């Protein structure tokens, strides 16, 4: 049924409010004002501000539309990383609210599980790196879970600092520098030199995914 | 005499401000809560700081005040030190990581950008020293690099907090930094750099013999 599309317009409004106001200050009443749906629509879909937040939390993973497989698995990880930064940088609300809920110190013991969604995000990077590893794309002896944490951490640090220092104006550049310097110690040299970090391929991946 | 006494109560004001910024964040922190906790007079605080904001920036910039053969080993040493301090819950480093990462009140009255620029400048200065001694791979943009070093610590630190409450902090920072350094250092320098938890334990020990909880000079105590 296509009112599970109004589910999408509820998450968007909810993410935007979380982004502007943080978890504690955000209210269901505000989310209802902002989305313009009905109390009964809302609750059909989500029982609490809490489940609404858990939903918004998953967006740094689940809001990126899927990407196509590439001759190099590592290029698919680049494609996903840069697509996430394109969204962040265009102010996509799901991604924005996800960043804010993740990094913002909560009121102590707000009952919100930040760990499970960050585990799923890292789990997905670990899955791609496992296929790269079996493809011979990675330097030997690397730990695929340590590496996955590094890539997510690197994205997160570059993105936050870019916010602080330029309001996200240099975001793509920074995330690209971070990711490319990380790939230099993870990719075998023959693969490294065939990876494409360009802004051009990144807008193309963006456009093709929107649809 | 008067100056050493004033410097001591200065340090107490910075330490106490950090602990409060840690628990409460910038906006909810109050000069009044800081006086309450330090036991220092308003007069002494007004003399040392122009505002809550300059004080928050002073917390942010504190670890920048705290000889090697290789300049990049200085960068390693300072970064892993911060991880050991944060791991232990040192108030200065806790408060400055919170004020860094916190969403703008903007509307917030805290300019994070100025003291972050001082962190970047410090890294940048070190990286130019490293270049003068030949330690860097050729043609690097020293600013873009300092930004990547600082962004790598920040993102390692955050995920480490979310996934493990900082239990694996030092391992994540070290992995992040080792991998970044590998993309930045000439190999002959990279093999000689020391990333061990051993060396970092020693550096931290040494730093802790010098990080006494500051107490105010008695002339600046509230009665």
Separation CA A205–CA A69 (nearest Å): 12
Tokens of B196: 């061990």
DSSP secondary structure of B198-218: HHHHHHHHHHHTT-PPP---G
Reported as type and span, the H/E element at residue B175 is helix B169-182
Closest B-chain CA to A104: B102
Asked if the C-beta of B158 comes within 8 angstroms of chain A's C-beta atoms, the answer is yes
Give yes or no for a contact between B27 and B102, defined as CB atoms under 8 angstroms apart.
Answer: no
Asked if the C-beta of B184 comes within 8 angstroms of chain A's C-beta atoms, the answer is yes
Chain A CB contacts of B184 below 8 Å: 181
Give yes or no for a contact between B104 and B110, defined as CB atoms under 8 angstroms apart.
Answer: yes
Distance, C-alpha A109 to centroid of its chain:
24
Separation CA A122–CA A24 (nearest Å): 26
Please give, rounded to a whole number of angstroms, the shortest distance from the CA of B43 to a CA of chain A.
32
Separation CA A196–CA B75 (nearest Å): 30
**Is B49 in a helix, a strand, or coil?**
coil
- Show me where the domains of chain B are located: 1-223
Contacts of A170 (CB under 8 A, 6+ apart): A162
Give yes or no for a contact between B186 and B135, defined as CB atoms under 8 angstroms apart.
Answer: yes
Residues facing B40 on adjacent strands: B221
Please give, rounded to a whole number of angstroms, the shortest distance from the CA of B104 to a CA of chain A.
9
Nearest to A195 by CA among A61, A65, A79: A79
Chain A CB contacts of B163 below 8 Å: 115, 118-119, 122, 149
Separation CA B158–CA B101 (nearest Å): 9
b/e for A15-36, b at 16 or more Cβ within 10 A? bbbbbbebbeebebebbbebbe
Asked if the C-beta of A119 comes within 8 angstroms of chain B's C-beta atoms, the answer is yes
Beta-carbon separation of B148 and A22 below 8 A: no
DSSP secondary structure of A146-167: HHHHHHHHHHHHHHHHHHHHHT
Closest A-chain CA to B161: A115
What Å distances lie between residue A27 and A14, A20, A94, A108, B120, CA to CA?
A: 9, 12, 17, 18, 38
Separation CA A160–CA A17 (nearest Å): 19
Q: Considering Cα of A12, then A13, then A14, then A16, what sign does the dihedral take?
A: positive
Beta-carbon separation of A115 and B162 below 8 A: yes
Mutate to test the interface with A, among B146, B148, B150, B165 (most CBs of A within 10 A): B148
Give yes or no for a contact between B18 and B62, defined as CB atoms under 8 angstroms apart.
Answer: yes
Separation CA B57–CA A134 (nearest Å): 48
What Å distances lie between residue A98 and A15, A134, A161, CA to CA?
A: 7, 32, 17
Look up residue B104 and give its DSSP letter: P
Which of residues 4 through 63 in chain A touch B, CB cutoff 8 A?
A: 22
Tokens of B36: 């309450």
Give yes or no for a contact between A84 and A155, defined as CB atoms under 8 angstroms apart.
Answer: yes
Q: What backbone torsions phi and psi does residue A194 show, to the nearest 5 degrees?
A: -110, 15
Residues facing A138 on adjacent strands: A187
Mutate to test the interface with B, among A103, A151, A157, A165 (most CBs of B within 10 A): A157
What Å distances lie between residue B219 and A104, A189, B3, B9, B43, CA to CA?
A: 39, 65, 12, 9, 11
Separation CA B216–CA B38 (nearest Å): 8
Give yes or no for a contact between B15 and B213, defined as CB atoms under 8 angstroms apart.
Answer: yes
Tokens of B122: 């410090």
List the single residue in A100, A122, A150 with the smallest CB-CB distance to B179.
A150
**Is A106 in a helix, a strand, or coil?**
coil
b/e for B63-72, b at 16 or more Cβ within 10 A? beeeeeebbb
User: What is the helix, strand, coil percentage profile of chain B, to 5?
Assistant: 70, 0, 25
Beta-carbon separation of B154 and A161 below 8 A: yes
Separation CA A66–CA A69 (nearest Å): 10
**Is A186 in a helix, a strand, or coil?**
coil
Beta-strand ranges (E) seen in chain A are none
Which technique was the structure solved with, according to the deposited record? X-ray
Tokens of B115: 């003291």
Closest B-chain CA to A150: B176
Asked if the C-beta of A181 comes within 8 angstroms of chain B's C-beta atoms, the answer is yes
């Amino acid at each position: 049924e296509r009112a599970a599309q109004t589910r999408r317009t509820i998450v968007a409004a909810a993410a935007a409010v979380f982004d502007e106001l943080g978890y504690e200050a955000t209210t269901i009443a505000e989310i209802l004002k902002r989305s313009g749906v009905t109390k009964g629509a809302l609750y059909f879909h989500f029982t609490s501000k809490e489940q609404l937040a858990q939903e918004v939390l998953t967006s740094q993973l689940r809001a990126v539309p899927p990407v196509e497989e590439q001759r190099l698995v590592l290029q698919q990880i680049i494609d996903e990383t840069l697509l996430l930064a394109q969204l962040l940088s265009k102010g996509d609300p799901l991604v924005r609210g996800s960043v804010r809920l993740t990094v913002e110190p909560g009121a102590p013991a707000d009952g919100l599980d930040r760990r499970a969604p960050m585990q799923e995000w890292i789990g997905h990077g670990r899955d791609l790196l496992r296929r790269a590893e079996a493809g011979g794309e990675l330097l030997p002896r690397l730990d695929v879970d340590a590496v996955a944490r590094m890539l997510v951490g690197g994205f997160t640090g570059a993105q936050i600092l870019s916010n602080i220092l330029t309001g996200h104006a240099d975001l793509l550049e920074r995330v690209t520098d971070m990711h490319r310097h990380l790939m230099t110690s993870v990719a075998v040299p023959a693969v490294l030199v065939r990876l494409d970090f360009s802004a051009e391929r990144s807008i193309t991946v963006y456009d093709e995914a929107m649809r």
